[PDB]
Design a protein around this motif. Sequence first.
Motif: not given
Lengths: 203, 203
Positions: B115-131
């Motif tokens: 579940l760790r992000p792959v890209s360096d440009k990452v914008l974190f969210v709490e849930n899939f709706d926000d995503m």
Amino acid sequence: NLRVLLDTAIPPSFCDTVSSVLLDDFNMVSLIRTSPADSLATIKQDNAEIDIAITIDEELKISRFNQCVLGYTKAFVVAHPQHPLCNASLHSIASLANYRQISLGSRSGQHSNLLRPVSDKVLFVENFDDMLRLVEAGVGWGIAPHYFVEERLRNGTLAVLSELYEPGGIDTKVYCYYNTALESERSFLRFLESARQRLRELG
Amino acid sequence: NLRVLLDTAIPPSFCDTVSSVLLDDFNMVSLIRTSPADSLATIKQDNAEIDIAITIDEELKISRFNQCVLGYTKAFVVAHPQHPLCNASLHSIASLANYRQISLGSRSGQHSNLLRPVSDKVLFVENFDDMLRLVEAGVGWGIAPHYFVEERLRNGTLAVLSELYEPGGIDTKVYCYYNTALESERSFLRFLESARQRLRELG
Ligand SMILES: CCCCCc1nc(Cn2cnc3ccc(Cl)cc3c2=O)cs1
Ligand SMILES: CCCCCc1nc(Cn2cnc3ccc(Cl)cc3c2=O)cs1
């Protein structure tokens, strides 16, 4: 000249499909067997000049290489039928961490999360033949591919432990690590669909 | 009283099967939704007194708990159809590490390899709706469950990037982390086969 690495874990059926499909586009095609534990270790040596690696082992991002999923293969946790855990009860699944495991060894001494042994009583080997020789002698239990143990399971020379963990056996992604160079070349794109489309018809 | 944790990644169909099957043996059954990123984090808090966790996230061995595979679920890498990588070419798959990813955030700040992000440009969210709100706005791309994006893909509001990586979408083991206590109790063994046998009939 194309150099392709294949895990000993990759069924010989998959190897027959890969090799066939490549000769349709490529004129020299070198096939190279490796312990799953030495697959990624190998491609990261720059001198080894591997172009494609088909392995079950998983590592997020590697220099020069991209990842993708060719298909799926099965693996079973196997023991001597007379092994204490033969009953394969749900407590026996937790108690695998107590009993001697016959794990694959890494030339690098290091293992991925996937191929790192689970129990503290570990006896390392180089290949699945060595693993199953020791497992037949009840020296311990081990995790080996389907095609390697299909023979012995019917013959009753070996028993399964894995069914409560994962019924049907342990599904395992076969990854294709390809040199970044090949992403543009349609020679490779042909191979990928072709190999996938044939490996899908096996499934 | 039985306390069951479910990932937001776990389809609502799977949730309907689990919940149903438990009431056949159990009298109080508390269901608890969690970000896949907070699933294991939660059960390891001893005070939280979770008995069963159904999550896609993978961690080898945990205090008090045993692992097993309930079944499989799908996940797609999705972007705004007008997203630069819309063509979904094999170079675009390597270039995902360049483009803004809308990744799930961990309350612990820490992520698993999965579940760790792959890209360096990452914008974190709490849930899939926000995503998917941000992904619909073309702010970036993201990896979300099948059931969450089935709607939008047909409606054409969203496009897929993942097909060259894994055709059919990204297969994902749904794990069942159960308190070691339950391994002996046949109440649980019933639930496991029953839930598996129903989740298999969905597949
Ligand atoms: C409850 C017993 C199972 C837990 C232990 C596991 N181990 C794994 C990783 N693993 C390892 N060795 C392999 C060899 C051959 C093949 Cl084909 C697959 C694999 C594999 O997946 C998963 S599950
Ligand atoms: C080429 C693009 C794909 C590489 C990137 C991957 N990511 C993963 C792990 N991962 C993450 N987030 C999920 C959310 C929801 C669901 Cl259902 C699954 C998953 C998942 O498997 C695999 S593959």
